[PDB]
Amino acid sequence: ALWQFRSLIKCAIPGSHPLLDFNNYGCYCGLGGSGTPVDELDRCCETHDCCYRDAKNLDSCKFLVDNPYTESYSYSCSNTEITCNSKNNACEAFICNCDRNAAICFSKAPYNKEHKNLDTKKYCKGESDKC
């Protein structure tokens, strides 16, 4: 679930505010995206979206017609470390892992505040590079 993803971000990056910080950043950090990623953190967000695309192609997820953004899963946070409950079903487990990979990628990527709230219409028009 989207709110859970943001919780994962807070876990890996306690020093941040998932919404104000990682939403409306670059061309892909936020709901969907387009164009060419502006930087490493932006690439993390692009990758994340493609992860959700892959999820929808999983057998289990297909049958569930599950929506990555609203599908809830079980996770726990421990000292900056994220854990996706092994009891989540295969689809839920793939979605949680997508979010987990994203959160970790964010934590490693440098944050460039000038990439915040870019004009998608004058910096992101076009198609994604991958997926």
- Residues that bind Ca ion in the complex, under the rule CB under 5 A: 28, 32-33, 49, 72
28 is in an annotated binding site: yes
Residue type at 8 in one-letter notation: L
CA distance 6 to 19: 7
Q: Quick one: which H or E segment has residue 78?
A: strand 75-78
Of the residues 48, 54, 115, 119, only one is catalytic, namely 48
48 catalytically annotated: yes
Task: Tell me whether residue 32 is annotated as binding.
Answer: yes
Least spacing, CB of residue 79 vs Ca ion, in Å: 26
Q: Which is nearer to Ca ion, 79 or 122 (CB)?
A: 122
Spatial contact of 118 and 111, defined as CB atoms under 8 Å apart? no
- Measured CA to CA, the distance from residue 78 to residue 112 in angstroms comes to 27
59 given a catalytic annotation: no
Binding site residue list: 28, 30, 32, 49
Active-site residues: which are they?
48, 99
